[PDB]
Design a protein around this ligand. Structure first.
Ligand SMILES: *[C@@H]1O[C@H](CO)[C@@H](O[C@@H]2O[C@H](CO)[C@@H](O)[C@H](O)[C@H]2NC(C)=O)[C@H](O)[C@H]1NC(C)=O
Ligand SMILES: *[C@@H]1O[C@H](CO)[C@@H](O[C@@H]2O[C@H](CO)[C@@H](O)[C@H](O)[C@H]2NC(C)=O)[C@H](O)[C@H]1NC(C)=O
Ligand code: NAG
Ligand code: CA
Lengths: 449, 446
C-alpha cells in the first residue's frame, strides 16, 4: 500500500542498467514475454479503443496515461483521458506487477488529445492539447492550439490549468504534446512538443535555411548533394500541411502547487532536429534524451542528447540505431536512406539500456514495428548503432501497431533487468486498437565466449 | 410479416447450393475472407465476451443470438442474451451485408443459457435454458432444467413462455438447447436438445444397451469387437456426470402467436445417435439434418439425415466427413478411431453445400478447429466424406475458438455461392472470446 516502489526496485529505477564495455551490445536480448501485466485498463467498451499511451517512471513511482474512445477509433471522435499513478511491486514469489495508487478518467467535455505524462515528486504531470477541430484544419487555423497542464496527485486529486498559448505559442498555428513521456528535471517538467510555425513569424524566420542530413550506416544516398539538401529543406515543410514548417520543440514548466506555472518554450535549431514529430523526454541516470518519432525521411530511432540550462534546453547530435527502423510510406520506408519530404512513420521509442563506463549510450531496448511500410509486426529487441539482437515478436505478423513506449528497470534485489513495453495493438478481426503492457527480461548469452 | 432480404437473394436461401455429380467435391474451396461483416455486436465491455453463437436463416430473414458477459468470460457469471432479427442485403457495389432490423438485449435476472435461435415465419424463435446452478450441480439435481421458448418478432417485441419442463423433460435431470440453430419445418420449430436422463426413467429404460459405433474411413479400430461394444456403450454414460446417460433429443414446438405451444420431445434411439451433445437442426432444400457436436469419441463432423412426421423426428445413419475433424482431449482427440468414454470436442457445424443430382449430400463447408487436442486454429474449408479442400485459416495457429457455425447462401444475381462462418474466437493480447462473422465465396478449380 506504500506510495512508492517496493524495496526490491529501490535503486533500480531510472539509472544506467548495464555498462558492459567488452561484450557486444546485441548479445543482450529480450526473453519470452513474461508476466503479462494488467495495470492498463482495457477499452471501456468492446467496440471502442484505448490509444496514445504515455508512460514515465521516477525512482518512487510511475505515471501512465491513455486516450479512450467509446465507439470506433477514429480521431474525429469524442474521447476520455485515463490518467494513473502507480508503483512497481513484487508478490511473495517475486512476481513483478504494476500497482496503481491512484487513477482518474477525465470523463468531462474537454477534448484532450496527444497527451503526455511525467512522474514528478508531486505526482503525475500531464500535458494535453484541447481542440474541437481537425488536425489538418489546426495547421490551417490562424491561432495556436490550446494546451493544458494537469496533475493527478498522490492524494488522488486532479488539477488542471489551461496555458496562455496565445503568447506561449504565438508563433504556432498548430502545437501538440509529443505523446511520449515527459521528464522531471531541476524542479521543472519537460515535455517534447511539435507543430506548425506561423509563416514569417520570429520562430519561423529563425529556422529559415536550417536543416540537417542524417545518413544511414553502410548505405549512402545515391542522390546528388544539390538534390539531397533540396529534399532535406523541404522535409520541414511537407505538402500535407501546406508549406507550414513542422517544428520540433521542448516545453519546460515549473512543478509546483500552481499548474502551468512559468512555461518556457525552447525551439532547438533545425540544424540539429529533423521535422517536428511526436517525441519523448526521458532521463536515464544523469543524461537526458529527446526521442523523436521518425515522421520524416529518417527511419532509424533518434535519441537526441538533451542538456538543461535553467528553464531552456539544448539538443545535440542524436544517437542513431540503424536496425531500430520504423515502417513508413515511400520514399520514407523503413529502408529509406535519402532525405525527402513526408509525414509518415510510427512512434516507437528506444529506452537507453546499455552504456559505456564513460556513460556514452551504447545500446537500447524498444518494440519496433518490423515492417517496411505498413504499421505492423511489433518486435522487442536490443539495438546498438547498427544491429539488433534476437527479437521477441509481440504477436503475429498481422498485428497492427500505432505506438510502443518502452521503459526498462532493474530489480536490484535479484539484479535482473526488465523492460516494460506498452503497445497500442490490434488484430484484423478482434476489434479496434487497445493498449497492452508487456514485460520482458533482458538476457545475455555467456556461453557464447 | 416477412421483411424480405433483397431481390438478389430469392431462390438462393436455404437451397442446395452446388449440384454436381462429376466435379471432385474438394475441387470447390473457400477464398479469402471477402469482408468482416458488422451485424454482430462486439462485447458491450472491453473486458467481457460474446459467446455461444446461434444462427438460422429462412427465405426472408436471418436470426442471430449470442450470450454476453460484462466482466471476463467465466461461464459461471451473470449474463444477458442478445437476440437479433435481420435481413441479407447488398449495396450498389454488390457488396453483401447483413442488416439487423430488430434486436433485443434480455438483461433481466434470469440466467438464459445455451440458447438456440430459429428463423420462423413469425420472427426469431429462441429456445433457452434458465439455470441457477452449475453444469454438474444440474446433473446431480432431481428436477429437469428450466427452458423457455421466446420470440423476437418483426415488430421488435420479444415474448417468452417458460416450458413445462416438469412434464416435458420429466425423464431428465439436466437439459439444454443444442446452441446451434433450430429449423422451421411443417408449421413447427425444431431444436436439437441434450442433457442427462434420470436413471431408470422410461426414457432411460428405452435406451438401456442401445449404442452405435461409427468408424473412420480408412482407419479401422484394432480393438476387439467386445471391447469396442463395451466402450461404445460406456460412451453414453461418461464419468463427467456420474453415470447419467447424456442423451441427444429433438424438441419441436408449434409456431404460433402462443409461445411454447404443443411441445413434443423426441428422443432418437441410441442405435443411431452418439452421446448427447450440442447440435443444430438444418434444412437445406427439402432435406433436413441434425448436426451433433463430437463431444464423444467420434471426431469427423456428423450430419444425421432428419425426416419429420407429425411433431416427431427420425434420425438416420449420418453423413460423416473424415477430414472435418475437431480437437478433443485424449483419448477422444481429433485422430481418434475407437469407441471411448469422454466429454470433449467443440461445436463446429458443417453446412450442406454440394449435392448429387438425386439430392444425396456429398460436400459441406465449415470452419473446423485445425488441431489435435487444443481448441485452436480455426480454418474454413469445403469437405466431402474423406477430404478437405484448400483452406482459409481465420487467424493465427494459436487463435482460440469455442464455436463456429456456418450458413451458406447464394447471390442469384451474380450466381456466386457464399458462406457465413460465425466464430467465437480469442487471441493472446486482445482480450476474451468474441464472436466474429466471416464471409467467404466458394470457388472451384474449374
Ligand atoms: C567512451 O569510450 C568510447 C570508446 O569505444 C568512445 O567511442 C569512440 O568515440 C570517438 C569520438 O567520440 C569516435 O571517433 C570513435 O569511433 C568511438 N569508438 C567507438 C568504438 O565507439 C566514446 O566517445 C567515449 N565516450 C565518452 C563520453 O568519452
Ligand atoms: C445418388 O447417387 C449416388 C452416386 O452413385 C449414390 O451413391 C452410391 O450408392 C450406391 C448404392 O447402390 C453405392 O455404390 C454407394 O453408396 C454410392 N456409390 C458411389 C460410386 O458413390 C446415392 O445412393 C444416390 N442417391 C439415391 C437417393 O439413390
Ligand atoms: C482407402 O483404403 C484403400 C485400401 O483399403 C485404398 O485403396 C484407398 O486408396 C484409400 N483411400 C484413401 C482416401 O486413403
Ligand atoms: Ca437439474
Amino acid at each position: 500500500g506504500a506510495p512508492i516502489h517496493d524495496p526490491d526496485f529501490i535503486g533500480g529505477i531510472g539509472k544506467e542498467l548495464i555498462v558492459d564495455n567488452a561484450s557486444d551490445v546485441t548479445s543482450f536480448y529480450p526473453s519470452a514475454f513474461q508476466e503479462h501485466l494488467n495495470f492498463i485498463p482495457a477499452p471501456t467498451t468492446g467496440s471502442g479503443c484505448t490509444r496514445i499511451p504515455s508512460f514515465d517512471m521516477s525512482a518512487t513511482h510511475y505515471c501512465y496515461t491513455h486516450n479512450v474512445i467509446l465507439s470506433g477509433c477514429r480521431d474525429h471522435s469524442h474521447s476520455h483521458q485515463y490518467l494513473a499513478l502507480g508503483v512497481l511491486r513484487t508478490t511473495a514469489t517475486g512476481r513483478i506487477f504494476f500497482s496503481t495508487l491512484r487513477s482518474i478518467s477525465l470523463d468531462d467535455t474537454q477534448n484532450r488529445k496527444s497527451c503526455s505524462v511525467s512522474a514528478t515528486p508531486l505526482g503525475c504531470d500531464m500535458l494535453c492539447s484541447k481542440v474541437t477541430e481537425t488536425e489538418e484544419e489546426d495547421y490551417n487555423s490562424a491561432v495556436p492550439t490550446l494546451m493544458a497542464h494537469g496533475r493527478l496527485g498522490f492524494d488522488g486529486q486532479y488539477h488542471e490549468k489551461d496555458l496562455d498559448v496565445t503568447t506561449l505559442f504565438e508563433d504556432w498555428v498548430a502545437n501538440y504534446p509529443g505523446v511520449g513521456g515527459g521528464s522531471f528535471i531541476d524542479g521543472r517538467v519537460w515535455f517534447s512538443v511539435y507543430g506548425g510555425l506561423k509563416p514569417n513569424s520570429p520562430s519561423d524566420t529563425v529556422q529559415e535555411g536550417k536543416y540537417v542530413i542524417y545518413k544511414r550506416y553502410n548505405d549512402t544516398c545515391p542522390d546528388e548533394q544539390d538534390y539531397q539538401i533540396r529534399m532535406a529543406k523541404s522535409s520541414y515543410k511537407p505538402g500535407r500541411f501546406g508549406g507550414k514548417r513542422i517544428q520540433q520543440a521542448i516545453l519546460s514548466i515549473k512543478v509546483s502547487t500552481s499548474l502551468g506555472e512559468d512555461p518556457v518554450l525552447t525551439v532547438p535549431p533545425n540544424t540539429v532536429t529533423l521535422m517536428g514529430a511526436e517525441g519523448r523526454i526521458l532521463t536515464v541516470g544523469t543524461s537526458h534524451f529527446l526521442y523523436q518519432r521518425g515522421s520524416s525521411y529518417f527511419s532509424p530511432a533518434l535519441l537526441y542528447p538533451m542538456t538543461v540550462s535553467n528553464k531552456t534546453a539544448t539538443l545535440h547530435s542524436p544517437y542513431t540505431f540503424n536496425a531500430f527502423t520504423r515502417p513508413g510510406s515511400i520514399p520514407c520506408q523503413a529502408s529509406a536512406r535519402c532525405p525527402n519530404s513526408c509525414v509518415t512513420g510510427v512512434y516507437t521509442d528506444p529506452y537507453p539500456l546499455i552504456f559505456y563506463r564513460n556513460h556514452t549510450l551504447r545500446g537500447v531496448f524498444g518494440t519496433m514495428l518490423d515492417s517496411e511500410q505498413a504499421r505492423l509486426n511489433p518486435a522487442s529487441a536490443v539495438f546498438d548503432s547498427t544491429s539488433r539482437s534476437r527479437i521477441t515478436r509481440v504477436s503475429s505478423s498481422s498485428t497492427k501497431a500505432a505506438y510502443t513506449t518502452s521503459t526498462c528497470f532493474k530489480v536490484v534485489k535479484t539484479n535482473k533487468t526488465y523492460c516494460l513495453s506498452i503497445a497500442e495493438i490490434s488484430n484484423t478481426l478482434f476489434g479496434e486498437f487497445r493498449i497492452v503492457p508487456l514485460l520482458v527480461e533482458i538476457l545475455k548469452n555467456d556461453g557464447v565466449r
